Design a protein around this ligand. Structure first.
Ligand SMILES: OC[C@H]1O[C@@H](O[C@H]2[C@H](O)[C@@H](O)[C@H](O[C@H]3[C@H](O)[C@@H](O)[C@H](O[C@H]4[C@H](O)[C@@H](O)[C@@H](O)O[C@@H]4CO)O[C@@H]3CO)O[C@@H]2CO)[C@H](O)[C@@H](O)[C@@H]1O
Ligand SMILES: OC[C@H]1O[C@@H](O[C@H]2[C@H](O)[C@@H](O)[C@H](O[C@H]3[C@H](O)[C@@H](O)[C@H](O)O[C@@H]3CO)O[C@@H]2CO)[C@H](O)[C@@H](O)[C@@H]1O
Ligand code: CA
Ligand code: CA
Length: 428
């Protein structure tokens, strides 16, 4: 196996996502915005396996891999295709927008193994695909929910199903020599606090050391999947910087969390895991699909330096942060911008920036009363209410954009905002 599957390979371009991008560009009046959309359609995004039907629907998992072979032949270079394994029972257990089809109380773990992992592994095992690099992102949100959300019965009752299902997926996937495995580990605005950070290091160390290959069972971890947290807060580089007598991490936006950005968080986690016995060959991914924070939204434009207002930590931090969400827990349908393009080894210890969440796809429907045919357990979550308050701190609005369809469906109003707000800006 390679030390980094993203080195020396070009990213798979998902034609089914690109078709949505190009179709929206063809309906966009502004010719520069439309040309920016056409350029976005050329970048590489992950393919989500978000239900049993996704294995065969449309071109299906086999179709994407065949298309990857096609792109590899056309380019004369290896292709790296990213897959998201996303169907654990009691999925999305701390929210409502992405609850899945399998339930722990309805033989969900058994169905997960037999109807989801086993057919995926059979397909990835085909020797026709040996020349691809196949990256599997394992079950976003599941393990982070075990760190912070055990007070929710849907999470606590699922915890051993998560552990066993994830070990089962990784143990089977590790029998395939061109499959590179990354565990999801949330983002700095979720697990950055000392207690969450240490709980996560403990949890993931136990999960991996119980795998068949122990610490050799995975190739690393990914942060920021489907979230918006910046790679870097360049104007808040020191969480202990004293402003008006207080460290800036004490600001309301951070609540003493010393990790303001994903580079600090990902590299600190990598070092922590190496200290627990993981080999130094592990690498980190960061999802940069929607964390650029160009443009303007939520009453601010991107800061161009540290704030001139040093009269209080809150004023200073709020004027200096590029993450301009009202509250750091606002995960649904945010008016952010596309971030750095997918790219290999941008920083030591970082295997790649990737677009795992595909820009333009919804995080959740924005009002109740609407049922989706293809995901009958997807429901309205108040975090997606454009007129509501955050359910993590009701003093703040959700920031969610209106007119959003159910999670995963094309959200043209947000896609236009994400392209306009891209950082670095899209060049036609
Ligand atoms: O297979 C052809 C089929 O595709 C359908 O669209 C898929 C789309 O291909 C896929 O990327 C997407 O995956 C979603 C997932 O459903 C959704 O639950 C997840 O939501 C996130 C969300 O963004 C978070 O904020 C929060 O809600 O938690 C989850 C987990 O992070 O996001 C991914 C990526 O968007 O699902 C689509 C719907 O199945 C077409 O709709 C269909 O017509 C095609 O036949
Ligand atoms: O990242 C996308 C996923 O987000 C999930 O929500 C989590 C938020 O992303 C995260 O910011 C929030 O963090 C909490 C933290 O867990 C808690 O200890 C602290 O006190 O407050 C933070 C928020 O201020 O946690 C939530 C989960 O509870 C969504 O549930 C998921 O659908 C989405 O993909
Ligand atoms: Ca490696
Ligand atoms: Ca930093």
């Amino acid at each position: 196996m390679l030390d980094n599957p993203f080195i020396g390979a070009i990213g798979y371009v998902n034609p089914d996502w690109a078709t949505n991008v190009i179709s929206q560009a063809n309906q966009t009046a502004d010719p520069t915005l439309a040309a920016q959309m056409r350029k976005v359609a050329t970048y590489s995004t992950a393919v989500w396996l978000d239900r049993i039907a996704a294995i065969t629907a449309g071109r299906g998992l086999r179709g994407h891999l065949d298309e990857a072979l096609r792109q590899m032949q056309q380019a004369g270079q290896p292709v790296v295709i990213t897959l998201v394994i996303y169907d654990l029972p009691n999925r999305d257990c701390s929210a409502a927008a992405s609850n899945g089809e399998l339930l722990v109380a309805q033989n969900g773990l058994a169905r997960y193994k037999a109807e989801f992992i086993d057919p995926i592994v059979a397909i990835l095992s085909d020797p026709r695909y040996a020349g691809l690099r196949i990256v599997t992102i394992i079950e976003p949100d599941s393990l982070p929910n075990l760190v912070t959300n055990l007070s929710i019965p849907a999470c606590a009752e699922a915890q051993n199903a998560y552990i066993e299902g994830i070990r089962y997926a990784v143990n089977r996937l590790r029998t395939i020599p061109n499959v590179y495995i990354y565990l999801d580990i949330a983002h700095s605005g979720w697990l950055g606090w000392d207690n969450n950070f240490n709980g996560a290091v403990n949890l993931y160390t136990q999960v991996v050391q119980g795998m068949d290959q122990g610490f050799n069972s995975i190739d690393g971890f990914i942060t920021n999947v489907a979230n918006y947290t910046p790679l870097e807060e360049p104007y808040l580089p020191d969480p202990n910087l004293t402003i008006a007598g207080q460290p800036v991490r004490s600001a309301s936006f951070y609540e003493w969390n010393p990790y303001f950005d994903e580079l600090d968080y990902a590299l600190a986690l990598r070092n922590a895991f190496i200290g627990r016995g993981f080999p130094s060959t592990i690498g980190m991914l960061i999802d940069t699909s929607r964390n650029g924070w160009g443009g303007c939204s939520y009453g601010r434009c991107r800061p161009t330096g540290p704030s001139s207002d040093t009269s209080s930590v809150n004023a200073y931090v709020d004027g200096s942060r590029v993450d301009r969400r009202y509250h750091r827990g606002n995960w649904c349908n945010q008016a952010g911008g596309i971030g750095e393009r997918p790219q290999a080894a941008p920083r030591s210890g970082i295997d790649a920036y990737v677009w795992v969440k595909p820009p333009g796809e919804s995080d959740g429907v924005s009002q109740p009363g609407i049922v989706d045919p293809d995901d009958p357990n997807k429901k309205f979550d108040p975090m997606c209410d454009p007129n509501g308050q955050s359910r993590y701190n009701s003093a703040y609005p959700t920031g969610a954009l209106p007119n959003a369809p159910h999670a995963g469906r094309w959200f043209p109003q947000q896609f236009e905002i994400l392209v306009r707000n891209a950082y670095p800006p899209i060049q036609p």
